[PDB]
Amino acid sequence: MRLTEEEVQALLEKADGWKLADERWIVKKYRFQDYLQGIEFVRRIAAISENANHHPFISIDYKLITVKLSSWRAKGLTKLDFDLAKQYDEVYNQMK
Amino acid sequence: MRLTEEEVQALLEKADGWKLADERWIVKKYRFQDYLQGIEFVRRIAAISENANHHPFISIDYKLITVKLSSWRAKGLTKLDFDLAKQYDEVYNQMK
DSSP states (O other): OOOOHHHHHHHHHTSTTOEEETTTEEEEEEEOSSHHHHHHHHHHHHHHHHHTTOOOEEEEETTEEEEEEOBTTTTBOOHHHHHHHHHHHHHHHHHO | OOOOHHHHHHHHHTSTTOEEETTTEEEEEEEOSSHHHHHHHHHHHHHHHHHTTOOOEEEEETTEEEEEEOBTTTTBOOHHHHHHHHHHHHHHHHHO
């Protein structure tokens, strides 16, 4: 079930660091002090994503990891995207 | 030492899968049958990159891993970029 414009705005206001982009994606940048730690973060959130059968787009620009979420089957954002966003935030906070 | 246009063209002709992009970068796309295997590939080439004190840009679009190499200090491509390209190719071939 794709979230409406109003629902997306409401969820985004409670998701610090996540930004609406390309009209239907939420994007967050996670910075690390150690390059390999950024990689470990990627390894962990990838595992979580695979188990959720929901994969984000991830880019690794040295110590800056960019994560982009959206639901292609729903043609936009779903509650799952925001749930995963929080799960990724949790991993980041534990590592930091 | 930045490679000249002629040197880059010569090295690229012997680097299957690697393409010149954005004027001074070499880019390659590595496809996997398993999402987590693509992640493992990233983990391995990141380690190699960290030891070489030379980090590529990496993106993970589901099962497609894109790797982009260049030497910012040399303001272009260096022999090291092509050496790492071969090292990454080796990892990929071993995993496949």
